[PDB]
Amino acid sequence: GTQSVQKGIAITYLHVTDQIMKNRDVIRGENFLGNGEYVTFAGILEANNKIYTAPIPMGLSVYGSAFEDGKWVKYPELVKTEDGGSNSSSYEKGELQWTQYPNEAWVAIYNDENFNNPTLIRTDKISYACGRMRSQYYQTIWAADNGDVYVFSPSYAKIMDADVQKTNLPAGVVRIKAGATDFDSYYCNLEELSGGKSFLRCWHITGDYFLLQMYTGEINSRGTGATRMAVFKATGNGDKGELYYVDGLPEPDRISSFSGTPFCENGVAYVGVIPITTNHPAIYKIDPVTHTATKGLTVNATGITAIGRLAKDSHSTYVVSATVTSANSTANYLLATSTLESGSVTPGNNNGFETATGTAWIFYKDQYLYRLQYNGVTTAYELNTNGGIAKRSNEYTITRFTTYGIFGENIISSSAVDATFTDL
Ligand SMILES: [Cl-]
């Protein structure tokens, strides 16, 4: 056969029990959806004993636009004539950047973590299901407690330069019932409910309630103005969806950012709120039933990069990962606390453990906290038998990732990559 550089999908596993890293053979990304384009997985969602992801279309690679004399090139006027761009937006001559098919969304359903033989399904009711901010892809596919998978799209593609690459669909939601292999008839237009606004990203809270980080103005590539929260009850209003803005958070013009991953327990969501700059980050409790927020634990640091729990034998604690950023340096501290609802935490005591910053953080149940970092090594933490934060024995070298999640006993990370493939 003929080997060439093509777009692939990388999959990396961190097995939390064995403490072993494995690299899956690279998956072909070219023509993943049958239109020549390659994809970036957004989300590794465990539900119904299966993995759901949104394969986000990327446009055409250099290989894909040249393939069989431009078979896949629908809009040749968009193929780049020379190298250019900057950062994640950088492109090579011959690429077609961004999808040519913005008015649809796909979901891949995999039977297990081997990522073989996906069930690929398409809807024309929403655009693609992820959020975006510069180089980041945010998961927007989530399961209700009953296993129903809700597939949200903020319609990020509305901000594309070329008309044919804009979506004309409003931000909205569709559904895959638990155990089903295709979408049902559910559809909710979120812009009609929100006052014309989309969202940066979203998460599950409990039951059929989801948390949306809402925009105050237009969606944009820098995340500007993503300073409100709303609670979406998917089956509310007679299975039409119901959206309520959250009351009790700081005023939007006082919010610098929210932390990236809420912590959900006891039916509520705990969210890190970073105010504009004495004004410290604090963790707010959001009750989805009343769409009300209350101020809890104050964090005496720059930011909040993880909230969760660690447990070992008869010891357990909450763990807040906090950043300390100076003019000349970045630091991260893991801070133990018995409560998220009052008081404060401050680096500088025995209940704190310093780490390098990490690209992303994820808790595996209440057993481990993983600090995912590419080059830099990936590390993991636990409670020791004495109840203190401890580093696990094994470290890992992983590559750049754009999505991550847990299935079974594996932490899984993924990215679109260049790789050699053999064609017939
Ligand atoms: Cl439910």
XYZ file of C-alpha atoms in Angstrom, residues 3-418:
416
model
C 1.677 5.482 3.159
C 0.892 9.161 3.629
C 0.360 11.676 6.428
C -3.373 11.892 7.208
C -5.539 13.075 10.100
C -6.070 10.506 12.821
C -7.772 10.253 16.216
C -5.446 9.467 19.117
C -6.680 7.602 22.200
C -4.657 7.309 25.418
C -5.655 5.248 28.468
C -4.566 5.744 32.089
C -5.722 2.658 34.005
C -6.405 3.848 37.532
C -6.021 0.413 39.163
C -2.942 -0.927 37.361
C -1.301 2.522 37.159
C -0.422 1.801 33.517
C -0.648 3.978 30.409
C -1.546 2.507 27.033
C -1.683 4.108 23.574
C -4.378 2.814 21.270
C -3.470 2.373 17.636
C -4.390 5.642 15.941
C -7.884 5.682 14.425
C -8.363 7.041 10.871
C -9.922 10.528 11.128
C -10.146 11.097 7.382
C -13.710 10.722 6.068
C -14.924 9.762 9.556
C -18.466 10.980 8.771
C -18.562 10.023 5.087
C -17.975 13.476 3.616
C -14.173 13.507 3.607
C -13.722 15.736 6.644
C -11.743 14.731 9.762
C -12.940 15.100 13.360
C -12.077 15.997 16.947
C -13.883 13.997 19.630
C -15.698 16.232 22.127
C -16.585 14.307 25.299
C -15.973 10.754 26.535
C -19.386 10.140 28.089
C -20.033 6.920 29.992
C -23.725 5.958 29.934
C -25.694 2.722 29.508
C -22.377 0.837 29.618
C -21.322 2.588 26.370
C -19.160 5.574 25.335
C -20.811 8.523 23.593
C -18.823 11.269 21.888
C -19.544 14.132 19.536
C -17.211 13.905 16.497
C -16.718 17.611 15.771
C -15.937 18.193 12.056
C -12.725 20.017 11.284
C -12.930 20.608 7.539
C -10.459 18.976 5.184
C -6.810 18.175 5.704
C -4.220 18.669 2.995
C -4.713 14.991 2.203
C -8.486 15.284 2.273
C -8.755 18.240 -0.079
C -6.421 16.593 -2.603
C -8.101 13.174 -2.346
C -9.358 11.889 -5.720
C -9.025 15.271 -7.444
C -10.931 17.229 -4.809
C -13.884 14.838 -4.512
C -14.605 16.149 -1.043
C -14.165 19.849 -1.787
C -17.663 21.349 -1.927
C -16.470 24.986 -1.663
C -13.098 25.211 -3.477
C -12.952 28.961 -2.843
C -12.253 28.159 0.839
C -9.220 25.884 0.332
C -6.239 27.794 1.661
C -3.804 28.975 -1.005
C -0.852 29.332 1.382
C 0.117 28.691 4.989
C -1.175 31.232 7.476
C -3.202 31.899 10.593
C -2.069 31.918 14.204
C -2.188 29.502 17.188
C -4.977 26.865 17.020
C -6.312 28.749 13.974
C -3.100 28.077 12.025
C -3.612 26.334 8.693
C -1.473 24.764 5.991
C -1.734 25.381 2.273
C -4.350 23.053 0.823
C -6.392 22.693 4.033
C -10.050 23.648 4.142
C -10.475 25.029 7.644
C -13.741 24.393 9.584
C -16.623 22.258 8.431
C -18.389 22.663 5.102
C -21.498 21.118 6.752
C -22.484 23.333 9.706
C -26.233 22.553 9.867
C -26.006 19.121 11.466
C -24.609 17.218 14.434
C -23.263 13.725 14.815
C -22.818 11.359 17.763
C -20.647 8.235 17.828
C -21.689 5.432 20.197
C -19.016 2.890 21.072
C -19.673 -0.371 22.830
C -16.567 -0.107 25.037
C -13.177 1.551 25.489
C -11.632 -0.346 22.539
C -13.293 2.241 20.218
C -14.288 -0.235 17.522
C -17.167 -0.044 15.043
C -19.015 3.091 16.158
C -22.714 3.554 15.678
C -22.791 6.931 13.905
C -25.998 8.968 13.999
C -26.844 12.396 12.578
C -29.442 15.069 13.292
C -30.280 18.147 11.185
C -31.934 19.943 14.128
C -28.763 21.360 15.753
C -25.243 22.294 14.716
C -22.276 20.384 16.117
C -22.281 19.500 19.805
C -19.358 21.169 21.528
C -18.475 24.523 22.966
C -15.378 26.452 21.815
C -13.002 29.010 23.264
C -9.761 29.653 21.368
C -8.055 26.224 21.154
C -10.452 24.568 23.652
C -13.292 22.110 22.939
C -15.909 21.840 25.711
C -18.102 18.765 26.141
C -21.808 19.466 25.570
C -23.177 15.878 25.441
C -24.368 14.600 28.840
C -26.609 11.913 30.314
C -29.603 12.312 32.590
C -29.650 9.929 35.584
C -31.965 7.588 33.622
C -29.385 7.121 30.846
C -31.037 9.423 28.294
C -28.268 11.298 26.488
C -28.870 14.986 25.812
C -26.904 16.490 22.935
C -26.519 20.283 23.249
C -25.169 22.678 20.629
C -24.328 26.363 21.217
C -24.165 26.931 17.444
C -20.586 28.181 17.686
C -20.419 27.988 13.908
C -22.642 31.072 13.646
C -19.459 33.194 14.079
C -17.613 31.711 11.066
C -16.396 34.142 8.394
C -17.947 32.502 5.296
C -21.734 32.299 4.940
C -21.610 28.656 3.829
C -19.703 27.713 7.011
C -22.069 29.525 9.376
C -24.861 27.501 10.895
C -28.352 28.977 10.513
C -29.656 26.808 13.411
C -30.254 28.310 16.892
C -28.565 26.827 19.943
C -30.618 23.769 20.913
C -30.815 20.240 22.313
C -31.810 16.770 21.039
C -32.005 13.387 22.776
C -30.980 9.728 22.487
C -33.114 7.621 24.809
C -31.233 5.159 26.982
C -30.457 2.046 24.940
C -31.699 3.562 21.689
C -29.469 3.751 18.625
C -30.844 6.929 17.050
C -32.286 10.280 18.105
C -35.929 10.447 19.146
C -38.312 13.314 18.319
C -37.218 15.580 21.195
C -36.029 19.083 20.332
C -35.615 22.259 22.367
C -34.673 25.642 20.840
C -32.681 27.190 23.674
C -32.461 30.707 22.151
C -36.252 31.067 22.272
C -36.092 30.316 26.007
C -32.969 32.296 26.903
C -33.728 35.589 25.217
C -31.632 35.032 22.131
C -28.520 33.913 24.006
C -26.270 30.890 23.579
C -23.808 29.284 26.017
C -20.098 28.608 26.353
C -20.382 25.100 27.821
C -22.666 23.002 30.000
C -22.728 20.104 32.466
C -25.150 17.683 34.115
C -26.399 18.424 37.647
C -28.837 15.667 38.698
C -31.886 13.931 37.219
C -32.801 15.798 34.002
C -31.273 19.134 35.130
C -28.259 20.606 33.333
C -26.168 23.707 34.068
C -25.441 26.082 31.166
C -22.797 28.797 31.353
C -24.701 31.481 29.429
C -23.509 34.414 27.329
C -24.760 37.935 28.066
C -24.023 39.010 24.475
C -23.057 37.251 21.250
C -21.115 33.997 21.204
C -17.467 34.640 20.393
C -14.139 32.872 20.163
C -12.700 34.446 23.344
C -15.514 33.436 25.735
C -16.225 37.106 26.463
C -19.366 37.710 28.422
C -19.962 34.077 29.507
C -20.856 35.407 32.943
C -24.283 33.974 33.778
C -25.562 30.532 34.673
C -28.885 28.927 33.823
C -30.547 25.626 34.810
C -32.144 23.565 32.023
C -34.742 20.926 32.928
C -34.840 18.759 29.827
C -38.291 17.173 30.352
C -39.898 20.287 31.837
C -42.953 21.971 30.295
C -44.390 18.737 28.983
C -41.104 17.461 27.517
C -40.359 20.741 25.703
C -37.494 21.849 27.978
C -37.434 24.662 30.569
C -34.665 27.209 31.143
C -34.252 29.396 34.226
C -31.418 31.865 34.845
C -29.755 31.317 38.230
C -30.327 33.922 40.935
C -27.823 34.769 43.639
C -24.536 34.665 41.793
C -22.435 37.833 41.641
C -23.507 40.401 39.073
C -22.233 39.475 35.585
C -20.024 42.569 35.457
C -18.239 41.319 38.599
C -17.428 37.825 37.335
C -14.046 37.222 35.744
C -14.560 33.498 35.102
C -16.117 30.321 36.434
C -14.026 27.238 37.077
C -14.229 24.610 34.343
C -15.770 21.609 36.118
C -18.570 21.858 38.702
C -18.725 19.319 41.512
C -22.182 17.760 41.950
C -23.418 15.928 45.047
C -26.586 15.791 47.181
C -28.625 17.015 44.198
C -26.838 20.380 43.838
C -23.894 21.805 41.840
C -20.842 23.464 43.413
C -19.241 26.005 41.068
C -16.060 28.044 41.401
C -16.618 31.751 40.839
C -13.628 34.021 40.223
C -14.469 37.726 40.693
C -12.935 40.629 38.833
C -10.137 42.290 40.803
C -9.836 42.299 48.086
C -12.145 39.923 46.183
C -11.403 36.216 46.488
C -12.674 33.249 44.490
C -15.489 31.369 46.215
C -17.508 28.174 45.691
C -21.230 28.747 45.142
C -23.910 26.088 45.629
C -26.550 25.992 42.885
C -29.848 24.248 43.708
C -31.414 23.230 40.365
C -34.945 22.892 41.785
C -35.064 26.586 42.753
C -32.328 27.836 40.359
C -30.775 29.624 43.373
C -27.078 30.094 44.187
C -25.548 30.695 47.638
C -21.971 31.692 48.517
C -19.979 29.019 50.311
C -16.268 28.350 50.869
C -13.864 31.197 50.082
C -10.561 30.258 48.390
C -7.651 32.568 49.270
C -5.836 32.168 45.930
C -6.010 33.273 42.283
C -8.310 30.638 40.827
C -9.959 27.246 41.274
C -8.932 24.360 39.030
C -10.744 21.329 40.575
C -13.381 20.525 43.193
C -14.000 17.025 44.449
C -13.562 14.448 47.207
C -10.842 11.966 48.207
C -11.375 9.080 50.639
C -9.315 6.263 52.159
C -10.559 3.812 54.828
C -12.239 5.945 57.527
C -10.813 9.263 56.280
C -12.465 11.532 53.729
C -12.238 15.192 52.750
C -13.117 17.648 50.061
C -10.214 18.707 47.864
C -10.050 22.107 46.152
C -7.263 22.598 43.607
C -6.294 26.263 43.613
C -3.957 28.293 41.434
C -1.605 30.953 42.810
C -0.451 33.202 39.944
C 2.236 35.879 40.408
C 3.899 38.360 38.094
C 6.618 35.780 37.410
C 5.237 32.326 38.156
C 2.340 29.911 38.355
C 1.663 27.566 41.247
C -1.056 25.087 42.146
C -2.074 23.843 45.612
C -4.337 20.970 46.559
C -6.282 22.178 49.615
C -8.227 19.886 51.942
C -11.402 21.160 53.614
C -14.212 19.544 55.545
C -16.896 21.737 53.896
C -17.732 23.619 50.712
C -20.389 25.764 52.337
C -18.576 28.099 54.753
C -15.225 29.410 55.899
C -12.055 29.695 53.847
C -9.002 27.792 52.637
C -5.492 29.301 52.268
C -2.257 27.741 50.971
C 0.222 27.634 53.785
C -0.681 24.819 56.178
C -0.319 21.033 56.434
C -3.714 20.612 54.691
C -2.131 21.820 51.442
C 0.046 20.065 48.865
C 1.822 21.910 46.065
C 1.761 20.635 42.472
C 2.762 22.002 39.125
C -0.167 23.460 37.240
C -1.988 20.952 35.049
C -3.766 21.275 31.713
C -6.855 19.539 33.168
C -7.936 17.820 36.376
C -10.326 14.952 36.891
C -11.470 12.996 39.947
C -11.973 9.251 39.621
C -14.883 8.656 42.021
C -13.528 9.747 45.446
C -10.420 7.570 45.052
C -7.942 9.477 42.855
C -7.357 12.968 41.510
C -5.548 13.016 38.163
C -3.526 16.018 36.978
C -3.456 15.637 33.156
C -0.476 17.455 31.650
C 1.256 16.986 28.317
C 4.755 18.176 27.395
C 5.648 18.027 31.659
C 4.284 14.777 33.127
C 0.850 13.599 34.258
C 0.528 12.832 37.993
C -2.172 11.442 40.291
C -3.091 11.901 43.965
C -4.923 10.006 46.712
C -5.441 10.062 50.454
C -2.968 8.067 52.490
C -4.005 5.821 55.380
C -3.312 8.775 57.680
C -5.785 10.950 55.757
C -3.329 13.307 54.036
C -2.982 14.076 50.327
C -0.316 11.884 48.719
C 1.098 11.514 45.230
C 0.653 8.122 43.549
C 3.762 6.154 42.604
C 3.565 6.290 38.796
C 3.791 9.341 36.501
C 3.028 9.430 32.792
C 4.031 11.208 29.586
C 0.936 11.863 27.489
C 0.430 13.903 24.349
C -1.633 17.006 23.729
C -5.342 16.356 24.183
C -8.540 18.197 23.368
C -10.962 15.970 25.301
C -10.853 13.578 28.270
C -13.254 11.541 30.413
C -13.624 8.264 32.303
C -14.987 4.921 31.158
C -14.815 2.065 33.620
C -11.381 2.024 35.203
C -9.700 4.097 32.464
C -9.143 7.775 32.167
C -9.254 8.398 28.397
C -7.806 11.383 26.516
C -8.081 12.111 22.782
C -6.985 14.543 20.054
C -6.936 14.870 16.286
C -3.333 14.249 15.134
C -1.184 13.920 12.064
